[PDB]
C-alpha cells in the first residue's frame, strides 16, 4: 500500500461474499487530477493454489535467506564441497522491508555473499504466493531461477 507502483496483486476473499453469488465485476474511479495519482487493472481470476511443500520438494537445492531458515526446516539448502557451489532452483526471502534492508545487503556480491554467484547465471523471477488464511499478511517471497 505504501509502494504505489508495484503490480501488487489485490485479493478478495471468497468466503465473505454470499454462497449463491453468480458474477462479479471491477469498478475503478481515479477522481484525482495529480499526474502521479493513476490506476491500472487486469481482469479477475480464481487461482489454483497448491502447497509449497508439494511444489518445492524436499530434495531440490534452495537458496534460503539467513532470516528464513528456522521456519523452513525441510527444504535442503545448497551445499559446497571444494570451493565449487551448487546451483539452486528457488530462493526464499523475508518480507519487503526486511529483504530490502537486511538480507539483500548482508549477502550481496561486493562483500562476498551468495548473491554474487546467482546474479551472473540464474536470472530470477518472482512467483504468486499467499498464506493459507492470512490474506492481508506478507510472509515473504519465492523466486524461481532460470
Amino acid at each position: 500500500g505504501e509502494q504505489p507502483k508495484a503490480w501488487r496483486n489485490l485479493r478478495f476473499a471468497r468466503a465473505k461474499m454470499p454462497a449463491d453469488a453468480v458474477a462479479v465485476r471491477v469498478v475503478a474511479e481515479d477522481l484525482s487530477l495529480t499526474p502521479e495519482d493513476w490506476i491500472a487493472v487486469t481482469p479477475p481470476r480464481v487461482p489454483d493454489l497448491r502447497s509449497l511443500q508439494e511444489y518445492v520438494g524436499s530434495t531440490q537445492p534452495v537458496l534460503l535467506d539467513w532470516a528464513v531458515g528456522l521456519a523452513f526446516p525441510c527444504q535442503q539448502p545448497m551445499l559446497h564441497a571444494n570451493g565449487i557451489a551448487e546451483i539452486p532452483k528457488f530462493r526464499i526471502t523475508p518480507d519487503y522491508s526486511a529483504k530490502k534492508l537486511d538480507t539483500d545487503t548482508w549477502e550481496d556480491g561486493t562483500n562476498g555473499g551468495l548473491l554474487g554467484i546467482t546474479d551472473l547465471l540464474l536470472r530470477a523471477h518472482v512467483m504468486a504466493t499467499y498464506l493459507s488464511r492470512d490474506w492481508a499478511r506478507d510472509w515473504g517471497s519465492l523466486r524461481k531461477f532460470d
Binding site: 534460503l64 535467506d65 539467513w66 532470516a67 528464513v68 531458515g69 528456522l70 521456519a71 526446516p73 539448502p77 545448497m78 551445499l79 559446497h80 564441497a81 570451493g83 523475508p94 526486511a98 548482508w106 549477502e107 562483500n111 562476498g112 555473499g113 551468495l114 492470512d134 499478511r137
Partner: protein, 436 residues
C-alpha cells in the same frame, strides 16, 4: 510457545552445510571464510543436526543452560550475600522474575548468549568457592571455564571480569601457598590450563588460515571501533523491533538496581547481615562486563542477554537494600518507587513487536499499546507524577509523616511485582497470538 531470536535461520543454515564442506564456514557473507578463532560450539549443533533439525530439539542447550543458571543462582550465589538476602522471600521472587524477564526475549534462539551467561556465572562461583577454603584447584578450573567461554564468541570476553573481580583475596592464597610448595608448581598448572583452548581452536585450521579469515572479516564486515559504543544504546531507544518493550525492560531493571545499590552502599558503610565484599564483587563483575563489552567488533542489541544472570542477582540484593528495615525514611522509599514508575513509563513507550514469525497475531506489533485512545506510558507517567508529588511532600514534613500501613505495605517489594506483571504480559502476548 515462546518466541525465537533473529540469528536462528543463520546458525541453522550454516550448521546444516558444515558436514559436506568439511569445515565450519559462514556460507552467507564472507568469501567462504570460516569462523575458527571461535565457534567450537557450532560444531556441536552440526552434530545435533544428524538426529533431526526440529525446533524443539535444536534449542535444548538454551533450556538446560537457563535451568542450570537458576540452580546455581538460587543455591550458591544468594546464600552468600549474608543472612538477610537468604531468609527473605521477596529477594528470591525478585531474582526469579528478573531472570525470567531477561531470559525470555533474548536467550531462546540458537545464539550462544545463554551459554556465555552460564560460563560467566560458573567462573564467579568457582572463584568465590576457591576463596573460602584457601584452595587453588577451583581457581585453576575457573581459568579453563573462562578460556572456553571466550572461545565461543567475540562477545564472550566476560568471566574475565569475574576473574578480575576476585583478584585481591586470591593473591592472599597464591602468596600464602607460594611459601609451602615452591613457585613453579603454581604457574605450571595454571599455564597449561589457560593455554589449552588452542588445541580446540586450531584443531582443524592453522595459523595462516585464521589470520586470513581475520583480515577479510576486518577489512569488509561491520567492525566498529571502541569509541562507537554509544550505538548499542542508541539502537535501544528507537521505536522499532530492535528495541521494544520486551527488550528494554531486561536492561533497564538491571541498570536501575545497579545504580541504586551503589549510592546506598557508599553512604552506609556497614549494613547488618549483608556481608560486604561479595556485594561489592557482584557489582564489580557487572561494571567489568559493561567495560569489556566495549571492545567488541559488532554493537548489537542482542548482546544485552548476558546480563540475565547477574542482573537477577543484583535485583535480589537491591530488594533487601531498599527494604523498610535498611532504608528507614519514607521519602527515600517513595523516591525509589517514583523512579520505578518512570522506568516503566520509559519502557512502555514503544511497540510490542517480535521477530520474523513470532509476530504473527500478537496484539500491538506495529504501534504503541494505547489503551482507549490514551497511551500506557502516559498512564505510568501520571503514576510517576503522583508518587513524586508525595515524595516531594514528604521532603517538607516533620520526619514522621508517612509511616502508616498503606505506604509501608506498597513499598516492601515493588521489583518482584513489576517483573511479574511484565512476565505475565510476555506470556499473554504469545498465548493471544496462538489463540487467534
Amino acid at each position: 510457545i515462546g518466541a525465537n531470536s533473529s540469528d536462528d535461520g543463520y546458525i541453522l543454515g550454516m550448521a546444516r552445510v558444515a558436514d559436506h564442506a568439511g569445515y565450519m564456514s559462514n556460507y552467507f557473507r564472507w568469501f567462504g571464510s570460516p569462523e575458527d578463532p571461535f565457534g567450537w560450539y557450532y560444531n556441536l549443533l552440526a552434530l545435533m543436526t544428524h538426529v533431526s533439525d526440529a525446533s524443539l530439539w535444536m534449542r535444548l542447550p538454551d533450556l538446560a543452560a537457563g535451568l542450570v543458571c537458576w540452580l546455581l543462582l538460587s543455591r550458591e550465589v544468594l546464600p552468600r550475600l549474608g543472612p538477610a538476602v537468604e531468609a527473605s522471600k521477596p529477594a528470591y521472587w525478585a531474582a526469579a522474575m528478573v531472570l525470567l524477564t531477561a531470559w525470555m526475549p533474548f536467550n531462546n534462539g540458537l545464539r550462544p548468549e545463554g551459554i556465555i551467561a552460564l560460563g560467566s556465572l560458573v567462573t564467579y562461583v568457582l572463584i568465590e568457592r576457591s576463596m573460602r577454603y584457601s584452595r587453588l584447584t577451583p581457581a585453576a578450573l575457573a581459568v579453563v571455564t573462562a578460556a572456553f567461554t571466550l572461545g565461543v564468541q567475540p562477545t564472550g570476553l566476560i568471566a574475565v571480569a569475574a576473574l578480575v573481580a576476585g583478584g585481591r583475596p586470591m593473591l592472599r592464597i597464591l602468596v600464602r601457598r607460594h611459601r609451602l610448595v615452591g613457585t613453579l608448581p603454581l604457574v605450571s598448572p595454571m599455564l597449561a590450563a589457560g593455554t589449552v583452548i588452542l588445541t580446540v581452536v586450531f584443531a582443524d585450521q592453522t595459523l595462516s588460515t585464521v589470520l586470513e579469515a581475520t583480515r577479510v572479516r576486518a577489512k569488509i564486515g561491520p567492525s566498529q571501533a571502541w569509541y562507537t559504543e554509544n550505538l548499542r544504546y542508541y539502537y535501544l531507544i528507537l521505536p522499532t523491533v530492535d528495541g521494544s518493550l520486551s527488550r528494554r525492560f531486561g536492561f533497564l531493571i538491571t541498570a536501575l538496581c545497579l545504580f541504586t545499590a551503589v549510592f546506598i552502599m557508599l553512604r552506609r558503610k556497614r549494613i547488618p547481615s549483608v556481608a560486604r565484599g561479595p556485594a561489592w564483587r557482584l557489582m564489580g563483575v557487572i561494571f567489568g562486563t559493561m567495560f569489556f563489552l566495549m571492545f567488541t567488533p559488532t554493537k548489537w542489541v542482542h548482546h544485552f542477554g548476558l546480563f540475565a544472570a547477574v542482573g537477577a542477582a543484583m535485583a535480589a540484593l537491591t530488594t533487601v537494600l531498599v527494604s523498610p528495615s535498611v532504608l528507614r525514611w519514607s521519602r527515600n522509599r517513595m523516591a525509589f518507587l517514583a523512579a520505578l514508575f518512570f522506568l516503566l513509563a520509559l519502557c512502555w513507550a514503544t511497540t510490542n513487536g517480535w521477530w520474523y514469525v513470532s509476530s504473527y497475531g500478537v496484539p500491538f506489533n506495529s504501534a504503541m499499546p494505547k489503551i482507549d485512545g490514551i497511551t500506557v506510558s502516559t498512564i505510568f507517567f501520571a503514576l510517576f507524577a503522583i508518587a513524586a508529588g508525595y515524595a516531594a511532600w514528604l521532603h517538607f514534613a516533620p520526619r514522621g509523616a508517612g509511616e502508616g500501613r498503606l505506604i509501608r505495605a506498597l513499598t516492601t517489594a515493588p521489583v518482584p511485582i513489576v517483573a511479574g506483571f511484565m512476565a505475565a504480559v510476555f506470556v499473554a502476548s504469545m498465548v493471544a497470538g496462538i489463540v487467534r
